[PDB]
């Protein structure tokens, strides 16, 4: 099975091609993770996936999506990850982390607590920052503050510090969250970036925050560990061919700047779009990026059907298959997939105290 072939990137070898993508839990307190996360992550690692990427972890308090988001904006926040990293490694999975800044989509309620911007007089909320003072709209009506050049320098340094902390906590894989309408994506998109300084206008200027942040992170992140990013390569906003062309060009610059793998997604920059949701719908776009930028990729959305994961890999659409919600439903999805695909000794996807009893 292609799904169960190992994958090596830099000095890291994943035992199979199943990646658990970042999935926010909304269970942290002032950014500090706790036994929610410890058990959640260790349990997933034991389920058999080759790579487990920790949820969007804010580089700065105001870059959380919600009051429940994880953070890594101090050394104490970083040290809270150490036992979880060690548990993921003990289970034979590779520990990764997505470092993030929510930009104009920050200061929102948890998804089951309204999913919308926090009211102005709620003591939990905060001012958001972005390239330009323009609201997302819809359920995120708050107008962000336009960043100064010093704010740009500060946020870049927060990404650097976050990466240094992730490294020292023992993570073996990092993902910069440049997707999903958050700060990085919003610098790239003309919808959200109306700046007239070095950080907006042209393609080079809109790319600049992302490329400078990648380069700054690269100074502290070990060359022998995968350096990755998530990036929305189109919006489904009626501008798809031009946007894809620019996104592919940016992917080439990321590769030239040391990016080892790209997690290909949708922008979610603005609400007025028509995204054609369906099982593995991103496969063809991920394949195009992979081919035209000559860079390994992953993608997500509906790959929890094992045969579809297998087909994407065999078609060379993807190098890793990211499987999210199916792992919330069943932490042992990798074992289910092994059985479904007829892998020999499928139960030994799991550790011995499970595998022995589930043989045949």
Q: What is the DSSP letter of 12?
A: E
256 is in an annotated binding site: no
221 is in an annotated binding site: no
Q: What are phi and psi of 54, to 5 degrees?
A: -60, 145
Which residues on neighbouring strands pair with residue 227, listed in sequence order?
A: 174
C-alpha to C-alpha distance for 21 and 316, rounded to whole angstroms: 19
**Residue ranges in contact with a second copy by CB under 8 A:** 25-27, 35-36, 38-40, 42-43, 46, 87, 90, 111-112, 325, 328-332, 335-336, 350, 352-358
43 is in an annotated binding site: no
CB 163 to ligand FMN: min, Å = 16
C-alpha to C-alpha distance for 122 and 78, rounded to whole angstroms: 28
Q: Which helix (H) or strand (E) holds 130?
A: strand 129-130
Residue 354: Cβ-neighbour burial (10 angstroms; 0-12, 13-18, 19+): middle
Nearer CB in complex with ligand FMN: 188/301: 301
C-alpha to C-alpha distance for 190 and 201, rounded to whole angstroms: 8
C-alpha to C-alpha distance for 215 and 221, rounded to whole angstroms: 10
With CB under 5 to 8 Å by kind, the binding choice for 308 among ligand 8CM, ligand FMN, a second copy, none is none
CB 179 to ligand 8CM: min, Å = 6
CB 156 to ligand FMN: min, Å = 20
69 is in an annotated binding site: no
Task: Name 10's Cβ contacts closer than 8 Å, sequence gap at least 6.
Answer: 223, 224, 225, 226, 260
301 is in an annotated binding site: yes
With CB under 5 to 8 Å by kind, the binding choice for 21 among a second copy, ligand 8CM, ligand FMN, none is ligand FMN
Per-position DSSP letters for 312-359, written without gaps between them: HHHTTS-SEEE--HHHHH-TTHHHHHHHHTT-TTGGGGS-HHHHHHH-
CB 19 to a second copy: min, Å = 18
24 is in an annotated binding site: yes
125 is in an annotated binding site: no
**Residue ranges in contact with ligand 8CM by CB under 6 A:** 24, 56, 65, 180
CB 210 to ligand 8CM: min, Å = 16
Helix (H, G, I), strand (E, B), or coil: what is residue 149?
Answer: helix
**Residue ranges in contact with ligand FMN by CB under 6 A:** 21-24, 55-56, 98, 177, 179-180, 230, 300-304, 323-326, 357
With CB under 5 to 8 Å by kind, the binding choice for 203 among ligand 8CM, ligand FMN, a second copy, none is none
With CB under 5 to 8 Å by kind, the binding choice for 36 among a second copy, ligand FMN, ligand 8CM, none is a second copy
């Amino acid at each position: 099975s292609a799904l169960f072939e190992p994958y090596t990137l830099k000095d890291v070898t994943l035992r199979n091609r199943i990646a658990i993508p970042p999935m926010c839990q909304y269970m942290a307190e002032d950014g500090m993770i706790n036994d929610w996360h410890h058990v959640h992550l260790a349990g997933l690692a034991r389920g058999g996936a080759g790579l487990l990427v920790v949820e969007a972890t804010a580089v700065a308090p105001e870059g959380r999506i919600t009051p429940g988001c994880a953070g890594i904006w101090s050394d104490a926040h970083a040290q809270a990850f150490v036992p979880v990293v060690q548990a993921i490694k003990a289970a034979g999975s590779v520990p990764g982390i997505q470092i993030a800044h929510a930009g104009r989509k920050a200061s929102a309620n948890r998804p089951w607590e309204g999913d919308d911007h926090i009211a102005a007089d709620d003591t939990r909320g905060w001012e958001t920052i972005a390239p330009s003072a323009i609201a997302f709209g819809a359920h995120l009506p708050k107008v962000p503050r336009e960043m100064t050049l010093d704010d740009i320098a500060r946020v870049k340094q927060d990404f650097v510090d976050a990466a240094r902390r992730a490294r020292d906590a023992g993570f073996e894989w990092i993902e910069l969250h440049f997707a999903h309408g958050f700060l990085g994506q919003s610098f790239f998109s003309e919808h959200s970036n109306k700046r007239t300084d070095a950080y907006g206008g042209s393609f080079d200027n809109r790319s600049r925050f992302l490329l400078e942040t990648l380069a700054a992170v690269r100074e502290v992140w070990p060359e022998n560990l995968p350096l990755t990013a998530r990036f929305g390569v189109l919006e489904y906003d009626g501008r798809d061919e031009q946007t894809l062309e620019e996104s592919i060009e940016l992917a080439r610059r990321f590769k030239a700047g040391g990016l080892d793998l790209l997690s290909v997604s949708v922008g979610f920059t603005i609400p007025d779009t028509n995204i054609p949701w369906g099982p593995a719908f991103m496969g063809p776009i991920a394949e195009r990026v992979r081919r035209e930028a000559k860079l390994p990729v992953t993608s997500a959305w509906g790959f929890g059907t094992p045969q579809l994961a297998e087909a994407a890999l065999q078609a060379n659409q993807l190098d890793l298959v990211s499987v999210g919600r199916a792992h919330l439903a069943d932490p042992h999805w990798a074992y289910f997939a092994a059985k479904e695909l007829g892998v020999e000794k499928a139960s030994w996807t799991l550790p011995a105290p499970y595998a022995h009893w589930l043989e045949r």
